[model samples]
Target: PKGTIYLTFDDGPINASIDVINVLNEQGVKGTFYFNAWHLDGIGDENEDRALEALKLALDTGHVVANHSYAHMVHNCVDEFGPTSGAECNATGDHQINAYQDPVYDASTFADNLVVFERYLPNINSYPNYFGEELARLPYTNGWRITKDFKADGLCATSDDLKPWEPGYVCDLDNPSNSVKASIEVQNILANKGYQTHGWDVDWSPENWGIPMPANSLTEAEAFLGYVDAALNSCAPTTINPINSKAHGFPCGTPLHADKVVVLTHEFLYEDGKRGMGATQNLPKLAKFLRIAKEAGYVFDTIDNYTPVWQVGNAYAAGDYVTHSGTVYKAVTAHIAQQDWAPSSTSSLWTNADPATNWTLNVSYEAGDVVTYQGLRYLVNVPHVSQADWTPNTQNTLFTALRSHHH
Candidate 1:
């Protein structure tokens, strides 16, 4: 399989990003642009002209225009802090309330976000927030911002909510238990709802925490080209395996797990007058990156152009039966084909309905060529959901039910 590289941009839909888009377009690379209306010009810098023009430029380039939020900056509210419902949590020395918080956040932030989404593009697919309702999102500082919004909106329900630590919230990478239970619930909900949420693989913007500096200091041409280098470095440093780079860490989907590479860059870095790398370095270098990456076999692509794996563990995630051409085949359960492939059923809602431990299936083989399990003949078909490598004892034992002929 050919390796995939995705280019995505976060915190954008601003004037500066215009140059970024131009570079991407000229180079013929497709990218995912995560946008929050507030960041385009922020609460105080609401310049519709710049913001709208930026939006138009990205869409015109055939980019995937998605939502991040109307207000991008998230504040650490002690009690009741948010982009909506700004009241209650007064600003403190350490954790100041985000000024963008509106008294009625539902309509102010989320609703306005939808409005801006429609107002500008009129026809684009976007996630209003990261809860997965929106296909993609940037969790404030680092993909660490999972708030009550996801649950409150009926998106996910993890067994535990221990956060502010690694593997926190809906799922934890370090803990298999957390990942298994949480992923099942989360995946089930998203699948049922016909939604898929995603994370970024690359961020071209620099992390700024300085108190004060010239507005355009970081926005110069040198900085812009540096951003592209940084963007490319994010792919994989020279020494490491170019096929795999762990530089960006979690939320940026596991490498080679999917087809396209989604890179996230910030538009705020450019915008005219502000003088950030948004203007100086992005376009010129972007053109070069696009040409080189493509010639090297990297294709510019948007999220919509990407294809999703529809199978999991001998079952069709979209449904239990596999339909090829016009014929459909029931998934086999409880036996292997000459010990080659494991017996499984896509029709059986085994992951959720069947416990993991008691997993079992019975198989009866035919003399000539084919195999049968659970009274069903076998054929070639890939599992939509991959069986979990590890399972809780409780769920593990239930695997037998997945292959039960009685079901």
Candidate 2:
């Protein structure tokens, strides 16, 4: 199968959202949108009354909706607004300073920021749920807090000193640094709260940020497809450390989705009148990009289900099948740890099976059904839901021994 690509748009629910959604709908693909509700306030100059309608429309059209923080601050409010909580900082004042790489708050402050989304959309009770029931993306910085065992920080995304071209800033790349500590604490906090946050593997934004660029300012449609392919083949940033080190002679095989790429962009890029490009200027480029990717055997999926399951430290239940060291193995019994009972050992706890082996937890069986176990076929004498416990053998009446052999 071809690799997957999860298309995500962030900081949206603006005027351009409807058009972006329409383009995706026309392409017969789904996307995940991380929206901020502050725009729905209906305040002039910044108010976008269509915000909620756009959100509801996306949900209605089968797209995924996620939280991007309610206020979406870009400043270190503590510096000027005075030290306070996340909500208090937002309410105090708009410092208008960019804090993308700065250490702004603690774990509790980060968790409070999430509550804003819940208060705004109290009725939304689904995946990407309000109040961290589903997925979330942090503001400004690129960080990932997927699961308790699988977590990562985006290297090369922040710096202790601002880039020469940008304004002065402060960040800490080393552990125990305020920024690093806060980020780690925030990840633990959100993970404990049951939120699965993800960062992007590729971005579609133009070099220009404040002033809007032309709709077609980005790379050509064909080039964008190449970017997707490269990201799938490339190593993810945080997968090669000592703890989750690669043992398969490959570079970071544990991608969020096997061979799948996640592309990020903002809805504001396509807004018709936002940058003086008529309503449909950049829409064609998006359409072309989707068509090019689809022609290259790429499929779009929502981020919620696209999380990669083939990572170390994952709890494998009975009958769980995992691909490791380029071979597939099925668990013969339940175990909490994988270090002692590795699949390489011909232990009774596991069975080394070919990729297409018949024994699978995903299937159910009935009387007269036949299945292969350890290169031999067996007959089902009694109906039963197949699981890790029911290995076919001569003594088990549910499975009658068969003389026939199968590869």
Candidate 3:
């Protein structure tokens, strides 16, 4: 009876994001904007005449703003990289892009995305609804790094042979192309950096995927409502078609992800001019879709709120993680969370597990463990229990600063 729709708009901070933001503002619903900060400086190649304002407006209005990568991997869409390059796949609208480079570039591309996002919004990390520190959505790929227990990739989200959105394009998930292989590597690199890259479960787009998007609210709104139910009913991500169909490959009845549909749509699709009467027509449909969902008892929430903040009335299972006050904690024992027993203050029930920070002291340091400390990365050389004084840089035997990032 209850369904949560994490309505996420990707590749934004462009002119269309403003319209999309205003629609959500008026609808009184919170949506997530997986933004590309490069557009803020007016170089994103979209109709981004007011990207700076759009980003500020989204954040100021209480929407979740997070990373979608800087430049959208356009630098990877080169002749030397993949099958298609030059004008065909190098443009901003080419969501079917790649990260066809080595591990370092792939890793830094995601790492730099967060830093550059801060450059545009400045105080984004401090914002209450901010999840860029943990939540991300890879451009052109439906990948997810939600939890240690819940992570998957869209092996077919990108390709070297043909554009994913093109007619008659098919792919075998088990045997992905080199571009997809590299893209998957980036997802792993991001996860190691303590970021959760999520993919969409559903997409709200034009029936006809053609030039100048069709912007008829009355025509598409009612039909779109079916998706909310369909995604919940069928954890079968393959069932989603015509556009977006990549989810973190998990089966039905999966906790936290089942029944919750992360609906993806681009801000550019809702703009006026060459995209057809977008704001005038599609914006109304946006309102109508919200109205319909409300009538159907669907709840709207940002992705950051997906794994709800810890509470005082549930039996948390081992391996379950909870969020509280910018820090995440893993359940050490299955117990009912009682009153005033905060995650950090309470012992035995939980373990501090915030991924986006420096390595902690007295934690088990296994061989091959990689952690960041003092803005530098270090890899463990030998297995040993960490002591309070053995910081990565302080000692030379247990840890080695990764050579590639070293000065």
Candidate 4:
């Protein structure tokens, strides 16, 4: 149990994506689907039944749908060096950076996508009502594609000569030069508002390929299995990560240093490729992959419960409340509303949510920290294991949970 498999897909919901969905569904595997509004452009056109059918099919299955920016064309949209016209109109979380944030990047646009998705599947035809999927994947795998601090001019995307219907190159702006800070600020903002960004640790397409060719292009099945094997072997036996060290951590600057390994994959590759080969080539390889993954003791997970740190602490004590730092939080059986505010390596709150035992307050409050159960802030001393044992995640978690719950 070194890591959890986070099978995520990007730039999809297209016609080619249908079979991918079917295969994953048939396999009893759920995945994350990052989508762009631009892809739906002609999908609703009077004669574009094929396009509409594909979009609807994603929701028709239990796949977790999320935002990938309105336009997957980030270089031509979000980055200053990219196309600035159809960019998302917003910053990480401030209006000060409004100049850099895309005007199109707002809650309104995101909300609209949810509404549109619901319309496609009125019932649980796609997802279970209890699933609670608020998942989203960034455009262009733009985990590090944000402001100057984190955004990359030339990371992963298509080349100048690429076409949507054709093949393209992948960009890794953070690799050699580290153009991106690999922070989670952007993700933090979104998560704060109840959103999760899904990223892949496994890609079906080779490095920098725009559209993955057919499965037959993968002449070497062992080579493909090798990649999956590598991921399988890297996992460690642990529950939560010791570190959050990934580019998507964005403004948070947390590293993806996990005690366990999380595997990412593209469902489409197991079924068929848009250009090169069809499922005929991929099916056998997939059979091998499934056998290996299960034999190696790997469990599949939908992107939902894997990355976002959902439902940490469930039950809580009745009266324990504290006021610390500028914010307030509850301890003992309290649960964090969202992962963005969850205690991290950079924060000072007890992630365990049991203030008396595991957490310390950020500001200052004591065990008897008389907190407003309804709507008032209190100032008091916080309980700590000792002076040096204090950690940020504990304190931050305590404050956020107590305050949000009390009032």
Whose TM-score is greatest here? 3
lDDT of 4 by residue, 303-345 (tens): 5454333334443343233222212233424444344554332
The C-alpha local distance difference test score for the whole of candidate 2 amounts to 0.57
Q: Report the error of model 4 at residue 43, Å.
A: 5.0
- Candidate 4, superposed: residue stretches over 4 Å from native: 1-3, 37-61, 73-109, 122-126, 129-133, 142-188, 210-216, 219-221, 232-274, 307-407
> Model 3 lDDT vs. the true structure?
0.72
Which parts of model 1 have CA positions greater than 4 angstroms off? 39-48, 73-112, 119-134, 141-195, 207-261, 275-277, 305-407
Per-residue lDDT of model 3, residues 1-407, tens digit only: 47888899988889888888888898789999898767765666678879888878888899998777776776676545332332345354554545555656856765677787788778877778777767778777777776544666777766676666668778777687777788777777776666766677777766534334444432478888887777775774545564335553655466767668888888877877666777777888888999999899899999888877898897899867787664566787788899877676335666655433357643445688787887788888787645557888877788889864432
In candidate 3, stretches whose alpha carbon ends up further than 4 angstroms from where it belongs are 79-99, 207-219, 236-238, 242-244, 312-320, 325-328, 336-341, 344-347, 351-407
TM-score, one value per model: 0.49, 0.62, 0.79, 0.52
Ranking by lDDT: 3, 2, 4, 1
Poorly placed runs, candidate 2 (over 4 Å)? 42-47, 75-122, 126-132, 155-172, 175-177, 208-216, 236-251, 273-280, 308-407
Candidate 2 lDDT, 1-407, residue by residue in tens: 48788899987777778888999999788999887655654421232667777877787788887767554543344454321333455453332233333333433444454464456555665633232345677664466664322355643333333431244533334442333345544554555444667776667765433324445466666887877787775754333222111111122555334587778888877775534463455677788999988888888888766542235466767766554442335566777645655555345655543322254443335577666677677877776555556678543767776773421
**Cα RMSD (Å) between model 2 and the true structure?**
14.7
* CA lDDT of every candidate: 0.39, 0.57, 0.72, 0.41
Task: Supply the TM-score for candidate 2.
Answer: 0.62
Query: Positional deviation of 307 in candidate 2, in angstroms?
Result: 3.1
Span of ten consecutive residues with least summed lDDT in model 1: 145-154
